[PDB]
Design a protein around this ligand. Structure first.
Ligand SMILES: CC(=O)N[C@@H]1[C@@H](O)[C@H](O[C@@H]2O[C@H](CO)[C@H](O)[C@H](O)[C@H]2O[C@@H]2O[C@@H](C)[C@@H](O)[C@@H](O)[C@@H]2O)[C@@H](CO)O[C@H]1O
Ligand SMILES: CC(=O)N[C@@H]1[C@@H](O)[C@H](O[C@@H]2O[C@H](CO)[C@H](O)[C@H](O)[C@H]2O[C@@H]2O[C@@H](C)[C@@H](O)[C@@H](O)[C@@H]2O)[C@@H](CO)O[C@H]1O
Ligand SMILES: CC(=O)N[C@@H]1[C@@H](O)[C@H](O[C@@H]2O[C@H](CO)[C@H](O)[C@H](O)[C@H]2O[C@@H]2O[C@@H](C)[C@@H](O)[C@@H](O)[C@@H]2O)[C@@H](CO)O[C@H]1O
Ligand SMILES: CC(=O)N[C@@H]1[C@@H](O)[C@H](O[C@@H]2O[C@H](CO)[C@H](O)[C@H](O)[C@H]2O[C@@H]2O[C@@H](C)[C@@H](O)[C@@H](O)[C@@H]2O)[C@@H](CO)O[C@H]1O
Ligand SMILES: CC(=O)N[C@@H]1[C@@H](O)[C@H](O[C@@H]2O[C@H](CO)[C@H](O)[C@H](O)[C@H]2O[C@@H]2O[C@@H](C)[C@@H](O)[C@@H](O)[C@@H]2O)[C@@H](CO)O[C@H]1O
Ligand SMILES: CC(=O)N[C@@H]1[C@@H](O)[C@H](O[C@@H]2O[C@H](CO)[C@H](O)[C@H](O)[C@H]2O[C@@H]2O[C@@H](C)[C@@H](O)[C@@H](O)[C@@H]2O)[C@@H](CO)O[C@H]1O
Ligand code: NA
Ligand code: NA
Lengths: 344, 344
């Protein structure tokens, strides 16, 4: 078991527009797009990419600007679908094979090859990559071993090395990393201790450090971080308090101040943020209202403003964004979304 | 002849710190570094990377976070020097051969291979690239032909294709582009007309469009841009007025509003900026004071604030940055810098 997942995958397109991806009642992937690269842009309305999926669908942008979506299929293999040219039409769904037991997780190597991570049937971490920059065909699968109990998350260190985080068998945060950029050589798994009750979330700070956020045993928001740029060792676990009922989401303001979001016990959206600068201390928690039925999803738009998505009481996706004064009122983007997360 | 050049090359390191590179009286490359990734950080003071150079030295950051500096040597070959690991020590200077007659210009392909452009002895555009991501050895040289009369500038389109701009024999802005990302296949040269009297400057907008700035025949600041994301055709040339005595410099605010900087006729620093948003109209010109003896160099720091560098009356580098209210007073970073630009 883990805290309630995010309901969509969001990305900033090559032309600065937000685009969201989720799963409908029919089990198809659906997406909604800003028309314009500005806060409060009108949206396309939902449109189907078809397929039948049994995980959260996860969008990542290739280094040539083409979006690509990954999802577990009905046969448990990894499936994907991609734009044929940047912000143009999409391929058919195509299988990358294997058998997976988590949502896929994706990052670009420094050489432009996408690399995908997901839990296997043996509960270990497996991975597969593009054989050349932003293109098929793909390598064969291999395992990075471990035994994990949450969806994995990947990021890149400030020196190019990929690094994966997941909950272990003891409910601690564990991790593993490339020993060189683009490499097929990885470290051993290592533990960062704690006890966590959500999927870990990872982000890179302005100063080139991986920082991880997760829900603890007391249902407060905890985090932990690399102490120096791309370098071990890590800090201790520190709490950011609150009581939260969903997974957390994290984004950088336009000044690189980190801001965390989560569903509270009153089932409203709550957030806490670094004050002053990106090395500053965190605010106390404060409410953005709404009643919501998924973890929030946060992203920075092309006006440098944070925008947050969450499923509503009507199962539609709803949206609120930063203004000069405070935040916008909640507005509805329609649709009816389900949580297809492979691990719940 | 062209407007007075920028005196330094600036970059944002992998850990969010500004770092500047210039040329001293001895013809060595010297650099100065922020200690901390914040506006108003103290600086290292100047420190020598040695070498003897006969162009402006140009720093670019590899996709593994390692800085690499390019400069024409005393034998007219292209020379370079690189960090052996991210923000660690530097290699020795090493020659990439050839004979060049401009400052080098650099960009990363979507596959992580750096590619360098520079004018040849035949006055054509030549280029050379890393054979693999963020690493030597390098390809052999080849020409993209043309005949050009300014330092070239390269950027990347929002679909991964590199594109180079330079002044032609008729003093118009001309350009050429990859037909596919990472490719060795390029278009023919094409003209964007106008008459320009500075090196062209190029930047990508929040909405994935290349936008070019240059000084015109009337010594006003002009610009021109792609009309749709990564797509021809371009707009017409439009003027931003002012009277300017150096090359322009351009940077994005943390909200992606573009901001242009130049030396005025009173030899102070002047700037004009998009108002409201990144699709908004440009302000009237306004003074940041100082008396300065080089074009300004502008960059956004890790607090999302613009910082501007320019050589002073004492030949030292001076620095002013955005605040809440207005801008900081000019402060001195010491040193004695010369303009080693291969084209003046
Ligand atoms: C290159 C090519 O033709 N690929 C085929 C896929 O397009 C096929 O997948 C399915 O496509 C149809 C429309 O033609 C529709 O989108 C289906 O929902 C989709 O199949 C489902 O969704 C996938 C993601 C998997 O879960 C699959 O097992 C589901 O049946 C498949 C045939 O299904 O074959 C490819 O060759
Ligand atoms: C630095 C170091 O050696 N750390 C040890 C880890 O490598 C160990 O993890 C396990 O390693 C073996 C290979 O020797 C294999 O990969 C296991 O699957 C892996 O352990 C599992 O996965 C972890 C993420 C946890 O969930 C763990 O509870 C699983 O048993 C561990 C094993 O005790 O010790 C480290 O000190
Ligand atoms: C554009 C517009 O008029 N939007 C209205 C929303 O602001 C309303 O949402 C609700 O706002 C109140 C405070 O004014 C409070 O934040 C509520 O919790 C919130 O509504 C709930 O949360 C939403 C995210 C959904 O789950 C919704 O079903 C809940 O009722 C809505 C009221 O639905 O009206 C809009 O017109
Ligand atoms: C791998 C290796 O040993 N490379 C040699 C370079 O380091 C040499 O260059 C020069 O290095 C010395 C210190 O040893 C000092 O920095 C000199 O200023 C520098 O040479 C000058 O600057 C270069 C950029 C060129 O302009 C060069 O022609 C100048 O003489 C050179 C020998 O000069 O050989 C390499 O093999
Ligand atoms: C679309 C198209 O065909 N445009 C023409 C350009 O390709 C031409 O430029 C020249 O092309 C030849 C190869 O056929 C060669 O590369 C020349 O060096 C190049 O012209 C020179 O470089 C330019 C940047 C200008 O400086 C020009 O004045 C030089 O003579 C031109 C040539 O007239 O016409 C375009 O229509
Ligand atoms: C930290 C501090 O006290 N800085 C002082 C600077 O603000 C001073 O610079 C000058 O400021 C005035 C307005 O107050 C005006 O902007 C001048 O044009 C500017 O000084 C000139 O421009 C500089 C960039 C240099 O070229 C300098 O040689 C010129 O005199 C300076 C005065 O030198 O004092 C600092 O202490
Ligand atoms: Na990730
Ligand atoms: Na450039």
């Amino acid at each position: 078991t883990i805290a309630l997942s995010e309901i969509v995958s969001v990305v900033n397109t090559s032309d600065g527009r937000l685009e969201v991806f989720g799963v409908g009642t029919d089990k198809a992937v659906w997406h909604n797009r800003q028309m314009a690269p500005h806060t409060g842009s009108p949206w396309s309305g939902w449109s189907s990419l078809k397929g039948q999926v049994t995980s959260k669908p996860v969008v990542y942008i290739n280094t040539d600007g083409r979006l690509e979506v990954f999802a577990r299929g009905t046969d448990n293999a990894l499936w994907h679908i991609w734009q044929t040219a940047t912000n143009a039409g999409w391929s058919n769904w195509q299988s990358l094979g294997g058998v997976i037991t988590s949502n896929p997780a994706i990052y670009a190597n420094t050489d432009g090859r996408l690399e995908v991570f997901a839990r296997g049937a043996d509960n270990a971490l497996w991975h597969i990559s593009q054989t050349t920059a932003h293109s098929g065909p793909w390598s064969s699968w291999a395992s990075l071993n471990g035994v994990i109990t949450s969806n994995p998350t990947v990021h890149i260190n400030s020196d190019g090395r990929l690094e994966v985080f997941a909950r272990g068998t003891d409910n601690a945060l564990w991790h593993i990393w490339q020993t060189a950029p683009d490499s097929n050589l990885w470290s051993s798994w290592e533990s960062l201790n704690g006890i966590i009750t959500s999927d870990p979330v990872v982000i890179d700070t302005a100063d080139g450090r991986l920082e991880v956020f997760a829900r603890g045993a007391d249902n407060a928001l905890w985090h932990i971080w690399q102490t120096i740029s791309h370098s071990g060792p890590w800090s201790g676990w520190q709490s950011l308090n609150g009581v939260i009922t969903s997974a957390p989401a994290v984004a950088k303001n336009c000044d690189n101040r980190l801001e965390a979001f989560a569903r509270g016990t009153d089932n409203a959206l709550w957030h806490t943020w670094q004050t002053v600068s990106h090395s500053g201390p965190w605010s106390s928690w404060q409410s953005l209202n709404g009643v919501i039925t998924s973890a929030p999803t946060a992203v920075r738009d092309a006006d440098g403003r944070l925008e947050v998505f969450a499923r509503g009481t009507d199962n539609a996706l709803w949206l609120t964004w930063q203004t000069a004064s405070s935040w916008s009122p909640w507005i509805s983007l329609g649709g009816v979304l389900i949580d297809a997360s492979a691990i719940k």
